[PDB]
Design a protein around this ligand. Structure first.
Ligand SMILES: [Cl-]
Length: 516
C-alpha cells in the first residue's frame, strides 16, 4: 500500500470517521458545555453516564485505524532515503494522534501499538524530541508526499505544524512541569510556529450526501462531525446550543452570536436535503431586545434535555417575530408556533452542518492565545494584550475563511473588544481567564482541544449539571474517559498497573497534566 495513502487515511479519520466522532456529540461537547439538549448529548455527557462502548470509541477506532496505518507506513519507509518526506510526516501525525489518545485515557499503548501502557509523562517528553527529530528529516532531494489533505505535501507547513504542536504541548505541561514547559515553549518559538492563517492545520473534507446507512460508516471522505451535528433526524433532534456557550456569545454582544447560532423552525424541512428550514434568528433577537422583560429566547442548562425547559410562544403585537410567524402561517395554514416552541432555543448555524467543513487540528488563532498566556506567565517578552487581540481577530477570521460566515467587520471587532468582559484586564489571573475563555470559543470547532484546554486552564469555569435529571456516575464533570473494560481481560497486567498508578481510578481521576 502507498505510504501517502496511509497518511491520508489517518488524517481523514479524525473528523471523517462516524464511529469515532460520535464521542464528541455524546460526551466531549457536553463536558465543554458547547452543546446540550439533543438526547444523545444530554443522556450521556449531560447525565455523567458511563457507557463502555461509547467511552471506548477513540480507543476502538483510532488504534486499528489511524495508529495502525501510520505505524505500518512508518515501518515500510523507515530505511528508504527516497521516502524521508512521507516518513517524517507520518511520524509527526503519529505524535498528533498519540496526544489525542493520552488526553482521553492517560497512560496508553503507544511504543508497542501496532507490553505495558506508556506513562503520560514519558509520552509528552517523547512528543517534544520526536517532533524536533521528524521536522529535521524533510529533504527537497526526496520523493513528494503524493496524498495529503492537511498540507497537500507542503514540507514547510509540516515543519511549522510540528513546531506549533510543541507549543501546544508545552502550555499543556505549564502546571505539572513549569520549568520544562517554559524551555520547550521558548524552543518552539525559536524554531518557528504558525505566523498567520496561511499556516493553519485543517484537513480538507469532501462534499458527500448525508447518509447514515451501513456503507456511510465505511466512508471518511466527508466531515462526519458536521453530519452528526445535522443528525439522522434533523426535524426532532438538532444540535441545540448549551446555555453556557449561548450566554458567553449573547450576553457579551459577540458578533459571532449570529454566525455560530440561529433560530430555526424545522417543521417543513427536507430530511435528506436539509433545505426548507425557516430562519427566524433576526426577528427573535430583535423582538427579545425590544422587549427585554418578555420571555422570548429560551435556554438549555447543562444537564437538561430540550424538553426540560419547555418554552412558550407569546405573540407580541407589532414585533418583527409576530410579522414573520404571520408570514409562515400564511404559507402553512396549519402551522401552530406554540405546539412545539423549542424553535425559541438557539441551534447551531447551517454553516457548521456541511460535509465539506474542515477538520481543524491547530490554528494560528490558538498560537496567538498560547503566546498571550506564556507572556502572562512571564516566560517571554511577548506583549500579552497584542497576542490576545490578534487571537480574537484570527478566531473571527476563521469563521469566514473555512465556514463561509459573514466577515466580522473592523467596527464589529472594535465594539466587541470594548466590552467590559473582553477588554484585556490588568491582573494576570483575569487575563488567563480572558485568554482561555476566548480559546474555548475558538475550540468549539476542535472538541478534543476544547476539552483538553478547559481541563488544563480551568477557564472557563464550568459548573457541573444541577437539574432534576439524575447524574449516574458522579456529581463532577468527568476529567477523562475510562479504559475499555475488555482491556482487563486482554492486557490484565498493563490495565491493572495503569489504574494502580492513578490511585482511586475513575473518570473523576485527573490526568497527569491536569493539576488541581
Ligand atoms: Cl441517533
Amino acid at each position: 500500500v502507498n505510504p501517502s495513502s496511509q497518511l491520508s487515511y489517518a488524517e481523514l479519520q479524525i473528523y471523517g470517521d462516524m464511529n469515532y466522532v460520535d464521542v464528541h456529540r455524546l460526551y466531549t461537547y457536553a463536558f465543554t458545555q458547547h452543546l446540550m439538549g439533543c438526547w444523545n448529548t444530554t443522556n450521556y455527557g449531560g447525565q455523567h453516564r458511563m457507557d463502555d462502548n461509547e467511552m471506548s470509541r477513540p480507543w476502538n477506532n483510532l488504534y486499528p485505524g489511524a495508529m495502525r496505518n501510520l505505524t505500518d507506513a512508518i515501518e515500510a519507509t523507515k530505511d528508504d532515503g527516497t521516502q524521508v518526506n512521507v516518513y517524517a510526516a507520518l511520524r509527526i501525525f503519529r505524535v498528533y494522534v498519540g496526544a489525542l489518545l493520552t488526553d482521553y485515557y492517560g497512560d496508553i499503548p503507544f511504543t508497542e501499538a501496532g507490553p505495558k501502557y506508556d506513562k503520560q509523562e514519558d509520552l509528552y517528553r517523547f512528543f517534544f524530541s520526536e517532533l524536533k527529530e521528524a521536522a529535521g528529516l524533510f529533504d527537497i532531494n526526496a520523493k513528494a508526499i503524493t496524498s495529503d489533505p492537511l498540507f497537500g505535501g507542503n514540507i514547510a507547513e509540516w515543519i511549522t505544524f510540528a513546531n506549533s504542536l510543541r507549543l501546544r504541548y508545552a502550555m499543556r505541561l505549564s502546571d505539572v512541569l513549569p520549568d520544562l514547559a517554559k524551555t520547550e515553549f521558548v524552543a518552539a518559538l525559536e524554531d518557528g510556529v504558525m505566523v498567520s492563517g496561511t499556516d493553519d492545520a485543517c484537513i480538507k473534507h469532501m462534499n458527500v450526501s448525508y447518509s447514515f446507512g451501513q456503507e456511510a460508516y465505511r466512508d471518511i471522505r466527508g466531515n462526519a462531525m458536521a453530519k452528526y451535528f445535522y443528525g439522522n433526524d434533523p426535524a426532532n433532534n438538532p444540535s441545540y446550543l448549551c446555555q453556557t456557550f449561548w450566554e458567553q456569545l449573547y450576553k457579551n454582544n459577540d458578533p459571532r452570536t449570529t454566525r455560530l447560532c440561529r433560530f430555526y423552525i424545522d417543521d417543513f424541512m427536507s430530511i435528506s436535503t436539509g433545505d426548507g428550514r425557516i430562519d427566524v434568528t433576526d426577528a427573535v433577537l430583535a423582538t427579545q431586545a425590544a422587549n427585554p422583560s418578555a420571555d422570548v429566547i429560551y435556554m438549555i442548562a447543562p444537564g437538561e434535555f430540550s424538553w426540560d425547559n419547555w418554552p412558550s410562544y407569546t405573540d407580541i403585537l407589532g414585533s418583527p417575530l409576530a410579522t414573520q410567524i404571520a408570514e409562515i402561517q400564511a404559507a402553512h395554514p396549519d402551522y401552530n408556533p406554540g405546539s412545539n416552541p423549542r424553535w425559541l432555543m438557539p441551534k447551531l448555524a447551517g454553516n457548521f452542518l456541511r460535509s465539506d467543513n474542515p477538520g481543524i487540528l491547530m490554528t494560528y488563532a490558538e498560537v496567538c492565545f498560547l503566546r498571550a498566556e506564556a507572556a502572562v506567565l512571564g516566560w517571554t517578552a511577548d506583549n500579552a494584550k497584542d497576542f490576545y487581540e490578534s487571537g480574537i481577530r484570527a478566531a473571527m477570521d476563521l469563521l469566514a475563511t473555512y465556514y463561509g460566515c459573514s466577515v466580522v467587520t473592523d467596527a464589529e471587532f472594535a465594539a466587541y473588544i470594548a466590552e467590559t468582559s473582553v477588554a484585556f484586564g490588568a491582573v494576570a489571573e483575569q487575563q488567563k481567564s480572558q485568554i482561555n475563555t476566548q480559546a474555548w470559543i475558538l475550540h468549539f470547532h476542535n472538541p478534543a482541544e476544547a476539552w483538553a484546554n478547559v481541563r488544563r486552564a480551568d477557564y472557563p469555569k464550568l459548573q457541573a449539571p444541577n437539574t432534576k435529571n439524575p447524574l449516574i456516575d458522579g456529581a463532577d464533570i468527568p476529567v477523562r474517559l475510562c479504559y475499555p473494560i475488555k482491556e482487563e481481560t486482554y492486557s490484565k497486567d498493563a490495565y491493572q498497573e495503569a489504574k494502580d498508578r492513578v490511585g482511586d481510578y475513575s473518570w473523576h481521576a485527573r490526568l497527569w497534566w491536569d493539576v488541581k
